[PDB]
């Protein structure tokens, strides 16, 4: 290399990070399917996960989330966050899923002492989705 030249900028292996995301600090209910989601959330099996995620009936989603144990709903909507970060074409038909877990269980994860440290992916994804409102309003105008 010549001895009077500004060296060119290099990207290399730089992880581009958003500062908004961070790391850490007779039965009579309904017959429909949520223990499949429970032991599909025990392990990580995306096949039957998409089989339990490609439904859209809201009352069915209500009763499944209601029968779901609250202790694993945090990693449920973590993996729903990675699904909606991978693609946003069918954003709504599981945005209903990522809201109904909050609606049915809120107080448990409120009383969980570290919310944003392990939910820091989902609200980062949603603020990435929602921070570009004003210029798309300009687009619409």
């Amino acid at each position: 290399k010549d001895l009077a030249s500004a060296t060119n900028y290099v990207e290399g292996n730089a992880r581009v990070t958003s500062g908004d995301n961070f790391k850490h600090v007779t039965a009579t209910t309904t017959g429909t399917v949520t223990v499949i989601l429970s032991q599909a959330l025990q392990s990580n099996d995306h096949s039957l996960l998409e089989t339990v995620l490609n439904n859209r009936d809201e009352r069915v989603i209500r009763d499944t989330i209601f029968r779901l144990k609250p202790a694993l709903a945090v990693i449920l909507l973590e993996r729903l966050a990675e699904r909606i970060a991978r693609q946003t074409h069918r954003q709504g038909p599981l945005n209903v899923w990522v809201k109904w877990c909050l609606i049915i269980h809120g107080g448990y994860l409120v009383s969980i002492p570290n919310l944003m440290s392990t939910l820091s992916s989902l609200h980062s994804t949603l603020k990435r989705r929602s921070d570009l409102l004003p210029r798309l309003l300009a687009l619409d105008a």
Partner: peptide, 26 residues
């Protein structure tokens, strides 16, 4: 944009490590 740059005392020019785009908000 905030970004981190490292080197050893061999190299007289730094190399990029991580690229925090939009810190503290936007």
């Amino acid at each position: 944009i905030l970004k981190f740059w490292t080197k050893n005392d061999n190299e007289t020019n730094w190399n990029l490590k991580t690229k925090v785009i939009n810190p503290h908000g936007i």
